[PDB]
Amino acid sequence: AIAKRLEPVGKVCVQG
Amino acid sequence: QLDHVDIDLTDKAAMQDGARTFANYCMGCHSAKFQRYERVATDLGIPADLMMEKLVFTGAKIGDHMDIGMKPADAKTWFGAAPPDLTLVARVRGTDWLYSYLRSFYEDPKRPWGVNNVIFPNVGMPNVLAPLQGRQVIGCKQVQVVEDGKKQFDPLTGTPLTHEACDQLTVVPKTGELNEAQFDEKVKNLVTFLAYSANPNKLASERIGTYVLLYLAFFFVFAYLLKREYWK
Amino acid sequence: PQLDHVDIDLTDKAAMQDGARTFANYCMGCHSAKFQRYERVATDLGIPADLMMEKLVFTGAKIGDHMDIGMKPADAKTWFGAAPPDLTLVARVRGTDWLYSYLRSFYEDPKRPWGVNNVIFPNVGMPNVLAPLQGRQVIQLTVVPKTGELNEAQFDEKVKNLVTFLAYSANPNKLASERIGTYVLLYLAFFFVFAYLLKREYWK
Amino acid sequence: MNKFMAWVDARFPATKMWEDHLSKYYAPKNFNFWYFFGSLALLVLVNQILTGIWLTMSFTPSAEEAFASVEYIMRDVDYGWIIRYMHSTGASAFFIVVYLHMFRGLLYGSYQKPRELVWIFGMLIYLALMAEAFMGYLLPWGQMSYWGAQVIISLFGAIPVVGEDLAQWIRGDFLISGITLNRFFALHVIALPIVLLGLVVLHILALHEVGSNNPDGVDIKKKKDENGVPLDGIAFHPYYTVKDIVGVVVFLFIFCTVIFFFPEMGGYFLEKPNFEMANQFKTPEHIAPVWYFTPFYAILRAVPDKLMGVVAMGAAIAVLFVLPWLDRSPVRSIRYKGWLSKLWLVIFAVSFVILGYYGAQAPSPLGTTLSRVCTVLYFAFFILMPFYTRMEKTKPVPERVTG
Amino acid sequence: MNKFMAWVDARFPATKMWEDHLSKYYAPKNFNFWYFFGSLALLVLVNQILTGIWLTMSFTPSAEEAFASVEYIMRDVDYGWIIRYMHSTGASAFFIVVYLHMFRGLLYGSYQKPRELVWIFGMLIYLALMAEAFMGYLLPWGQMSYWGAQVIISLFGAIPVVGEDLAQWIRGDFLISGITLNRFFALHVIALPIVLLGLVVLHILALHEVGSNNPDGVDIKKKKDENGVPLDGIAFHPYYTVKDIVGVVVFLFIFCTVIFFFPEMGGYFLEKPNFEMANQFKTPEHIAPVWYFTPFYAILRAVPDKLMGVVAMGAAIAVLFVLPWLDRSPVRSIRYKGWLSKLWLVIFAVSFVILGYYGAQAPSPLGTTLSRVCTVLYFAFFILMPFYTRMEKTKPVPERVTG
Amino acid sequence: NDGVNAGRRRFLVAATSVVGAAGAVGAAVPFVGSWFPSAKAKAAGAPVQVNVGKIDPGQQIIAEWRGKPVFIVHRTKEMLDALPSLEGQLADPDSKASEQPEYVDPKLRSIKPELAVIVGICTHLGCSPTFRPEVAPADLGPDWKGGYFCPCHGSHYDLAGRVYKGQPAPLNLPIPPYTFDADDVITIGVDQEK
Numbered sequence A: 001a002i003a004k005r006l007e008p009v010g011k012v013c014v015q016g
Numbered sequence B: 001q002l003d004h005v006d007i008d009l010t011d012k013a014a015m016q017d018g019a020r021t022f023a024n025y026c027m028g029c030h031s032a033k034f035q036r037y038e039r040v041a042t043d044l045g046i047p048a049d050l051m052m053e054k055l056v057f058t059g060a061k062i063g064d065h066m067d068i069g070m071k072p073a074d075a076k077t078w079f080g081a082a083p084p085d086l087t088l089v090a091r092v093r094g095t096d097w098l099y100s101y102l103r104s105f106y107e108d109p110k111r112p113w114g115v116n117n118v119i120f121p122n123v124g125m126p127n128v129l130a131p132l133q134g135r136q137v138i139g140c141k142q143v144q145v146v147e148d149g150k151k152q153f154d155p156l157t158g159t160p161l162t163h164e165a166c167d168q169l170t171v172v173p174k175t176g177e178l179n180e181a182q183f184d185e186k187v188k189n190l191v192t193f194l195a196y197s198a199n200p201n202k203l204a205s206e207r208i209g210t211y212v213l214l215y216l217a218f219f220f221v222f223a224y225l226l227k228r229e230y231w232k
Numbered sequence C: 001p002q003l004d005h006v007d008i009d010l011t012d013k014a015a016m017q018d019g020a021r022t023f024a025n026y027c028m029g030c031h032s033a034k035f036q037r038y039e040r041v042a043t044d045l046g047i048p049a050d051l052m053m054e055k056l057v058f059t060g061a062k063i064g065d066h067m068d069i070g071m072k073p074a075d076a077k078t079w080f081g082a083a084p085p086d087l088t089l090v091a092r093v094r095g096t097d098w099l100y101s102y103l104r105s106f107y108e109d110p111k112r113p114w115g116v117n118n119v120i121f122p123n124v125g126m127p128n129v130l131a132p133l134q135g136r137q138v139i140q141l142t143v144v145p146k147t148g149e150l151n152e153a154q155f156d157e158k159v160k161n162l163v164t165f166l167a168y169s170a171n172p173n174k175l176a177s178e179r180i181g182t183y184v185l186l187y188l189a190f191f192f193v194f195a196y197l198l199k200r201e202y203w204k
Numbered sequence D, E: 001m002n003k004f005m006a007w008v009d010a011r012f013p014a015t016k017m018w019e020d021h022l023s024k025y026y027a028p029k030n031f032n033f034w035y036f037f038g039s040l041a042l043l044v045l046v047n048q049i050l051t052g053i054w055l056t057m058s059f060t061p062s063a064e065e066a067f068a069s070v071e072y073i074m075r076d077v078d079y080g081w082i083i084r085y086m087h088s089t090g091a092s093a094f095f096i097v098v099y100l101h102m103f104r105g106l107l108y109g110s111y112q113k114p115r116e117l118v119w120i121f122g123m124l125i126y127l128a129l130m131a132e133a134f135m136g137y138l139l140p141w142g143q144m145s146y147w148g149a150q151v152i153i154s155l156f157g158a159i160p161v162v163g164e165d166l167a168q169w170i171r172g173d174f175l176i177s178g179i180t181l182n183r184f185f186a187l188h189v190i191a192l193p194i195v196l197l198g199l200v201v202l203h204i205l206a207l208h209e210v211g212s213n214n215p216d217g218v219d220i221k222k223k224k225d226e227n228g229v230p231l232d233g234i235a236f237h238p239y240y241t242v243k244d245i246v247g248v249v250v251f252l253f254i255f256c257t258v259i260f261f262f263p264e265m266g267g268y269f270l271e272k273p274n275f276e277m278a279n280q281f282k283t284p285e286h287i288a289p290v291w292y293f294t295p296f297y298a299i300l301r302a303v304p305d306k307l308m309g310v311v312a313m314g315a316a317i318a319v320l321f322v323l324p325w326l327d328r329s330p331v332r333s334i335r336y337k338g339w340l341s342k343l344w345l346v347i348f349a350v351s352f353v354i355l356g357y358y359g360a361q362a363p364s365p366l367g368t369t370l371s372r373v374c375t376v377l378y379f380a381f382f383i384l385m386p387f388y389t390r391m392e393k394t395k396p397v398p399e400r401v402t403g
Numbered sequence F: 001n002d003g004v005n006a007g008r009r010r011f012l013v014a015a016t017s018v019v020g021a022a023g024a025v026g027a028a029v030p031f032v033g034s035w036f037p038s039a040k041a042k043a044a045g046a047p048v049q050v051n052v053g054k055i056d057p058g059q060q061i062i063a064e065w066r067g068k069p070v071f072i073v074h075r076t077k078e079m080l081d082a083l084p085s086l087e088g089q090l091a092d093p094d095s096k097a098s099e100q101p102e103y104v105d106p107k108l109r110s111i112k113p114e115l116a117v118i119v120g121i122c123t124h125l126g127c128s129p130t131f132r133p134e135v136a137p138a139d140l141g142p143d144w145k146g147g148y149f150c151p152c153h154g155s156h157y158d159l160a161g162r163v164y165k166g167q168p169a170p171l172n173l174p175i176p177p178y179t180f181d182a183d184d185v186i187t188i189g190v191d192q193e194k
């Protein structure tokens, strides 16, 4: 619950 | 004219969302250097590992202050004004001022960053929450009709009766992730976190003060009896 | 260890200027003198401010700045195994005789990390940075002939001037102190006679 | 213990002092609400000394760390926020209590003979307190701190000849900087506390030499019983000690309420702009003094001329020194002074409050007009005192205190 | 002025205090060299307060800037080097003068009845001075400073149960750090100066209540003239005021000689390793206390056990408190005590000096043995006093002061 | 005043005094509590990785671990043979009463004999002892065999960190929790695997 609330805004798409 | 916001410092979820917003959209330019990640996690109920993983982006330790890489002199050169430390900004400006300021950015091509602020005219801050709010402009939109405080709501639907006004902050449709209510809640959570940061002792202060006042009432009863008696 | 006595003259402006030159060129690479300012060193040594900036300020600092250096203490401690201490007060921490004997007591010791040891400061972490001037000194200390720019007498003067500047750096108020103290003591001797006579008059 | 006290009394005048100052020291029995404030001033002074000693354990008097050290106290030090709020609220409460103390002196003619020296020591205490609070307000090193110090020390630049040199010498620098911060910290933490403690000692000693006034202005010493005790006199200990204990508890209730619920007091006990770090290059839109300096500020702002404004602000405080010789009333208490004295005391209180209220805001037309009018009235309360204290008709002072 | 003093005296105890304490206060006329040191201690306390106030205007009580701020005082502040040397040499002179004062008390039995309270207040002053000097010595934040603070705070770690927790609480940290430095700065700069001022006031008040002893130990109050003035008594003002002025001038001559020519005094007033910034990881090869703390340090170093060494040091100072009751001699002055008292006072002086001398250098075999012998002699001077003050035969005390 | 009610006066005085004393304790709570380690102090410290392959025989290096100096000494053979010869001079030769990891040698007080990692803080009043590997210094006596000598009050430890008898120091120098990440690299602050 807290972890979802605190998710960083920037999402990075990584190879594999 | 500021907009009132009812800020609940006992809401851990709201403060957590505000802390996330501050760590992501705000700590790029603004520091909270008078405040430690460890204390923020303890007061917001965030586990230390979770705080480290989710809110500490600068490689600092949990007990370190919320410092940022942007130096005040560099940022003053770049923006024309140094982004102030935001630990105490809630105390410096108040929560209503912050709530109105973060929602009052509107496009203004005449300005260095293309935006101006109703609350803080000619502010040097770029509109960094534009992706969330969307494009906000000084345009024409529907505003509730008011005549000498005679505010008209719809008796049946309970929604406002509105007329067009042509000098209002209007968000261009389908330009931001969040609608007006969602951005309102985002800004409310951010201002709640800032209010906590400015005064992290508020809740403990109220508790301790309640106990102190109870004790002082007790002691006053005894001192008053010892006075009125012995004055006979 | 046994130290060599050196007579340090803090009124010798030329000697202190040579010592300041040696400190700026050979010593400020690793050591700071961060508790004194270039401006005050220039004023006390009789060096013009422009001349001080041109000849002794290599860090790009202003005349009024502390004699700081780029080598940070943590980095130097990692690199050398020991942090080069700030030398502003070293003449008071160690004394001029100890400094004079130490800067002349470096000899070659291959077992050491920097290939040198010191009689005064055994197993010291200092590289022998004045080797070009003194030459190759080996163990009794003897300098290998034709290995340094200066002979024994010329190098001793260089160390003496450097130690003299270090002596001044540790105590920049010594000359002004002895001048003021002379007048304070003269006044107190003058005041004592009046106080003594006043006491003698009353105690009859 | 009896034997222990006998041993001490042979070697220390403990019982003698106790019976000379607190017990067997007969104060008028008709003290009222207005006589709580000397003991409350002592309590606030003790609070300031203790909380300041503890803040000093964590405060850093450097321009680079003063504000950060204050936040370290507020957040990192265990209960440090409590101590800091005790200190700030205690400065504000010190001025509240001291102003009510001085107003009691005005009300009951307590500055008049024989208490002229008591009043003068009290005014020296007030000067020391103003200096102490001014130098303390610089210590946080916020925007208000820095810029108020800047303006207040620029006032010393208004002296026609030596003004600029004197201001630079006071600052210790060409501007307000960390040198000024450290200097004011040293003065505020030791020198002025020592001066204030000595002045309070002298003040209480003078009072006990001449004895306390009372709300009726009756010289209770005139009427004494067969034992030599005034008929209207009661031993300070225990009666007024317990009364002052009750007053101290009430004051502590208010003080702790402010500390734990409203430490800022609407931005008057802790000014909002002072929560922003001092910026030598950006000054606040409106810079105002702490509330307890606002009245004199208004006076200084009421005078169009700079040097004349500084002189008028200084005289606003200096005239209270000569107050004992300005009052020519045959009676002490306002209860028995003529209508003119009552009217002028009301006018002075209203003018002081209005000056403080309008010195706390940015200049305004009505504000400026009322500030000038109230400056005139404030100075007329003193300048006309020697006249309207004689013109009025005073009531006969009763032989015995009323109640 | 006559009229001005008449005005003051009706409102202040000015003349009465002057004639009770300084004038018309008849002290024995046979005060010698050993009676200069109370006034000199007062002067050194005033010097310490003033110089420390001026140092506090430029000192930064942070681990990052304390040493740098001290050098800033020495080099950048105009005459700041003078003030700092006055302060350090004044601490050393404070302990010199206080030790000579205590030794006068030992010589002439000034601790005996009726001056037990005078002696106890003096011992409280000495404890406050030890604490003040220790906490001041930490402030420069040199190697001496840091490691002396470490050792002395860890002394509290010797307590079997609450020792470690108490030491951590005193530190404010898990090791000596800027927290300890700042806390000790606060205690040194305000709390203990206030305590010392209060204790000095109490000390002098007790002395004036019971009266001053004299070298002959003659109670001059027994014999009085028809006016009530003791036959051997002279007004303290002007005779002893001028004598103390001469003593003050001589002390100032020595003090200024040290300040302006020998401020370090061979490394005993300003220690050489304290010119190196504090290093948490490098302990100086010769970590010795300031000279005036060496005698007790030696005592602690002479005891093989940790806790027993700490207790022995504590008991070395605490024993001086009970001295007024250990001395059962029928006479006050050493001039009329038996050979045993003179021999044991010589033994105590020699033991104290030897402990200080060997406590000022690194451990040695002869040093250790002499430290251990002088530790037992120092304690035997007190533990055997109740016995050898009765075994000895005392000369008759003259009815009049000799001279 | 007519017939003061004693007992009631005594009770009220006592109750007011007790309540005021409780309030005094409460008002002291902030001042006493502020002296405990603050958030600045509680920053703690992380384990330090030290490369010990470059330590010459009979030499020592200082590692900064949690604000304390750690003596990492590369012990030569001769001092290792000498260490058992000192057991008659040591208060706790087997380290029964000292603080050390459960996995270090009770006598050598190290994971490997040739290297000793010791928390370099004297167990009497807490100062880092001076490292004196020399055999028989004039000042340290002829019976010396190398070790540590506290410069504060002259506390003798052997090269294993064990305190000599009759010494201000009652305990052997603490051994920090450390491991060998590699034959020449240790880490101070983390226990070694069982």
Ligand SMILES: COC1=C(OC)C(=O)C(C/C=C(\C)CC/C=C(\C)CC/C=C(\C)CC/C=C(\C)CC/C=C(\C)CC/C=C(\C)CC/C=C(/C)CC/C=C(\C)CC/C=C(\C)CCC=C(C)C)=C(C)C1=O
Binding pocket: D130, D131, D134, D135, D147, D148, D149, D151, D152, D153, D155, D170, D287, D288, D289, D290, D293, D296, D297, D300, D313, E043, E050, E245, E248
């Ligand atoms: C917006 O803005 C504004 C506001 O703001 C926001 C305002 O609020 C206000 C309103 C302002 C107010 C009402 C606030 C008022 C505040 C104040 C009053 C603050 C003022 C404070 C200062 C600026 C500080 C000024 C301090 C000064 C000038 C005093 C300086 C004192 C010294 C430096 C002391 C000198 C030191 C000395 C003499 C050393 C001691 C010397 C010795 C001799 C010691 C003894 C030595 C010996 C014994 C040795 C010699 C031996 C002798 C004598 C021989 C004989 C021996 C014997 C001992 C007998 C305004 C107008 C404003 O618009």
Ligand SMILES: COC1=C(OC)C(=O)C(C/C=C(\C)CC/C=C(\C)CC/C=C(\C)CC/C=C(\C)CC/C=C(\C)CC/C=C(\C)CC/C=C(/C)CC/C=C(\C)CC/C=C(\C)CCC=C(C)C)=C(C)C1=O
Binding pocket: D043, D050, D245, D248, E130, E131, E134, E144, E147, E148, E149, E151, E152, E153, E170, E287, E288, E289, E290, E293, E296, E297, E300, F020, F021, F023, F024, F025, F027, F028, F031, F032, F035, F152, F153
């Ligand atoms: C080599 O190396 C070595 C050297 O070195 C180099 C050495 O030198 C030495 C040699 C050592 C020496 C000889 C040195 C000796 C030096 C020393 C003795 C130094 C020791 C100093 C310290 C370590 C400091 C220790 C300090 C301690 C333990 C004391 C701590 C005190 C406090 C924290 C104060 C407590 C705070 C309180 C209680 C606040 C006050 C409370 C209140 C209640 C205030 C009032 C409140 C109110 C009024 C509100 C409540 C209202 C009430 C009461 C209701 C009624 C109302 C009314 C007012 C009546 C050695 C051995 C050594 O080998």
Ligand SMILES: COC[C@@H](CCO[C@H]1CC[C@@]2(C)C(=CC[C@H]3[C@@H]4C[C@@H]5O[C@]6(CC[C@@H](C)CO6)[C@@H](C)[C@@H]5[C@@]4(C)CC[C@@H]32)C1)CO[C@@H]1O[C@H](CO)[C@@H](O[C@H]2O[C@H](CO)[C@@H](O)[C@H](O)[C@H]2O)[C@H](O)[C@H]1O
Binding pocket: E302, E303, E304, E308, E311, E312, E313, E315, E316, E372, E373, E375, E376, E379, F088, F089, F090, F141, F143, F156, F164, F165, F166, F167
């Ligand atoms: C163990 O005794 C120490 C000395 C003799 C010890 O003389 C004693 C001389 C007297 C004195 C100062 C001593 C204790 C308590 C002192 C008292 C406490 C009370 O306090 C007060 C105040 C408080 C009140 C409550 C009570 O009264 C007093 C009135 C009382 C008091 C202060 C008065 C005086 C007492 C030591 C013998 O030393 C041997 O020699 C070596 C010592 O280190 C040890 O050798 C080992 O360690 C060496 C490392 O150097 C290696 O060389 C070796 O190889 C290796 O074998 C060996 O173990 C050890 O025995």
Ligand code: HEC
Binding pocket: B021, B022, B025, B026, B027, B028, B029, B030, B075, B079, B081, B082, B083, B084, B086, B089, B092, B093, B098, B101, B102, B122, B123, B124, B125, B126, B128, B129, B190
């Ligand atoms: C979350 C997205 C943010 C919040 C909430 C705030 N900021 Fe900023 N900001 C920036 C600059 C260069 C300034 C100075 C502008 C000027 O002085 O004219 C500011 C200012 C503010 C203020 C005003 C505080 C005051 O006391 O006046 C507030 C309340 C504030 N900011 C809140 C720059 C930036 C920036 C760089 C791109 C970012 C990412 C943010 N600000 C983010 C936030």
Ligand code: HEC
Binding pocket: C022, C023, C026, C027, C028, C029, C030, C031, C076, C080, C082, C083, C084, C085, C087, C090, C093, C094, C099, C102, C103, C123, C124, C125, C126, C127, C129, C130, C162
């Ligand atoms: C880097 C190559 C250095 C230069 C160039 C100089 N010094 Fe040095 N110094 C250096 C280190 C790494 C150390 C510490 C050695 C150790 O084992 O602790 C030092 C130390 C000194 C000292 C000792 C001071 C003291 O122990 O209190 C002195 C007196 C000293 N250095 C003087 C000095 C002079 C005069 C130099 C120019 C001729 C000089 N140093 C250059 C590193 C370096």
Ligand code: HEM
Binding pocket: D045, D048, D049, D050, D051, D052, D053, D055, D056, D059, D070, D084, D087, D088, D090, D091, D092, D094, D129, D132, D133, D136, D137, D138, D139, D140, D188, D189, D190, D193, D196, D270, E190
């Ligand atoms: C009459 C007595 C005193 C008064 C009126 C007074 C007033 C003040 C004021 C108004 C402040 C500003 C507080 C703020 O706005 O943050 C302050 C700060 C400070 N004071 Fe004082 N003070 C007094 C005595 C003392 C004493 C005796 C000490 C120390 C011994 C002290 C130490 C401090 C410190 C360290 C600060 C900075 C921390 C802070 O601002 O809270 N004060 N003082």
Ligand code: HEM
Binding pocket: D034, D035, D036, D037, D038, D039, D041, D042, D045, D098, D101, D102, D105, D108, D110, D111, D115, D118, D119, D121, D122, D123, D125, D126, D129, D200, D203, D204, D207, D211, D212, D213, D214
């Ligand atoms: C700031 C710290 C002060 C303290 C601690 C203090 C203390 C006291 C105390 C305990 C009393 C006796 C009780 C009482 O009358 O309330 C007293 C009386 C008095 N005080 Fe204060 N005082 C202070 C400041 C002042 C000031 C600023 C003034 C006036 C400028 C003043 C003027 C007087 C007078 C005139 C009296 C005696 C009058 C009477 O008996 O009615 N005092 N003071």
Ligand code: HEM
Binding pocket: E034, E035, E036, E037, E038, E039, E041, E042, E045, E098, E101, E102, E105, E108, E110, E111, E115, E118, E119, E121, E122, E123, E125, E126, E129, E200, E203, E204, E207, E211, E212, E213, E214
């Ligand atoms: C440290 C600051 C001190 C000050 C300012 C001070 C002040 C004085 C003064 C002015 C006198 C009278 C004049 C004189 O005897 O020279 C005196 C007497 C005395 N002092 Fe102190 N003193 C201090 C410390 C001490 C200490 C540490 C002790 C003992 C432990 C002590 C014990 C005594 C005694 C017993 C007398 C009476 C001497 C006699 O009557 O012969 N004082 N003091």
Ligand code: HEM
Binding pocket: D190, E045, E048, E049, E051, E052, E053, E054, E055, E056, E059, E070, E084, E087, E088, E090, E091, E092, E094, E129, E132, E133, E135, E136, E137, E138, E139, E140, E188, E189, E190, E193, E196, E270
């Ligand atoms: C009995 C009174 C005092 C004694 C015996 C005393 C003793 C000392 C000593 C020995 C030092 C170390 C100086 C050094 O080694 O360089 C020191 C430092 C210091 N003291 Fe005190 N002190 C006293 C009172 C005061 C007071 C009242 C203040 C402030 C009002 C003060 C302020 C300072 C400061 C700022 C330092 C650090 C700067 C420096 O080391 O020169 N002292 N003190």
Ligand code: FES
Binding pocket: E151, F122, F123, F124, F125, F126, F127, F150, F151, F152, F153, F154, F155, F168, F169
């Ligand atoms: S510090 Fe090691 S013996 Fe005291």
